[PDB]
Symmetry: D2
């Protein structure tokens, strides 16, 4: 069990939340950056971010979260698409996460990404893609998932 604030839901030491208002990629990432981590004495230490995903288990959890929350929107295509923190740059091999973590799990639907350069990843929860990732235009207005600053203690 992970501990998270009210309205947020934990998996594997991370806290997530899906937001229902539609934002483009930059505004969405900005929205997530309004959530933070701070020392008890006042200093802001880190910021939130669109979600990153590092295992098939994280991916299945996020997929279920989208499907359970948006049950009447599930189509037979790709929709609903929901923003995560993935950025495809000048070539398909340039992949990064907004939280700056490493790209060590390939969750793309086969064929994807194919809308480069400078496209954005989204969870595509329609029956065609089953939650695995599509790349889209940053200017699309979509729902999105935030993560809280991911952190652990170090002992040494």
């Amino acid at each position: 069990l992970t501990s998270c604030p009210p309205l947020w839901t934990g998996f594997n030491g991370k806290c997530f939340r899906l937001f229902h208002n539609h934002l483009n990629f930059d505004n969405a990432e900005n929205a997530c950056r309004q959530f933070g981590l701070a020392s008890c004495s006042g200093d802001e230490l880190a910021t939130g971010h669109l979600a990153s995903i590092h295992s098939a288990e994280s991916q299945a959890f996020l997929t279920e979260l989208v499907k359970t929350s948006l049950p009447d929107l599930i189509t037979g295509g790709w929709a609903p698409q929901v923003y995560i923190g993935m950025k495809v740059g000048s070539t398909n091999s340039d992949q990064t996460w907004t939280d700056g973590s490493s790209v060590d799990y390939d969750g793309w639907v086969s064929g994807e990404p194919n809308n480069g350069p400078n496209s954005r990843g989204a969870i595509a929860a329609g029956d065609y893609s089953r939650g695995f990732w599509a790349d889209v235009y940053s200017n699309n207005n979509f729902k999105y998932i935030c993560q809280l600053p991911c952190v652990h203690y170090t002992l040494e």
Copy 2:
């Protein structure tokens, strides 16, 4: 912080979840009883339950949970109505919770309950009632909120 399993959300030492399929009151309560608490050695110790509410703060939290999860269904009326564990019996003063806890908070919209005997409580999230409670027929098919067995350590 409260620690809850994935998909569940904690407030004040309790873990809740909103389910989106429509069930009548008895089937809903049944669905919540599929979730339990167990010793690590295997004995089942308690069962889940439609949510109970013991303070204005619990009530505001559950309201926000319904409004954020179901933003497109919010009407100017009572709808969406969502089941909680409240039972009105033979008279209005016979009020009980399915988890067996005490009725020490009155969250009723004024004029409610008015559909007795043997009516059922629901959160009425439309703009008319703001999440405060209506009473209804047990045979209505609604979405519902489950709580996991509420539990604390005793230390002496």
Copy 3:
């Protein structure tokens, strides 16, 4: 990461505490039974217990907890010996835990148990045994480790 009450320390979903006063096996188990688990509505659901151990990792954690708490008592022999919930009955193969969990990890020092029938398990933290288990007389007065009722949520 595990949440425990003050003075108690968590590992892997369980909460443990070492007590410094010396008690025979029965009184010690009794002492741990003063700690409990309870519904928020009043019913007592389970009781504490001398620690059980189900993996090499639980074992190393308990060993470290003893060594770091009693640093001046560590001898080059078996001492200090500290009670856990292990019971050897009429034969060496009759091994049980007081919390009723399964004996699925062999933490015995080679040669142990050898003081049957009806002997008791103890962590032997002297340099000879490195925290691995000796069996002793139930009438020995030792320090001991309690665990709080171990519990998880069930989802199905």
Copy 4:
């Protein structure tokens, strides 16, 4: 309930630990600074510290932690004294904590501080002082209490 790493014990959203080796004030703080907080992607965000205390309840908890851990050392005087992060500067009114939090709770034994300038705080657990603070030389070798970086999420 607070979640802490193994061997550490939580109170009120903070994790603490008592160490049994004697160090002077600077070496003690240094030892606590070996424990940190870090982003999952690698950046070190904060460091540990000698404990700070901000309420009568924090103070009773730390007192109980010292008394339960060191039961044979309790004298009828001040001993055992145990370092916390309190610094008294050039005057008695110059009081600071090493974690940089605010001095908003007075836990001094009456008469203290009286060994300034540049003295240091310690919990004095003997029967004379009951855990409340004495000020001492920085060059005394004592046991000490560390706190892990105290942090919370900001919902802004």
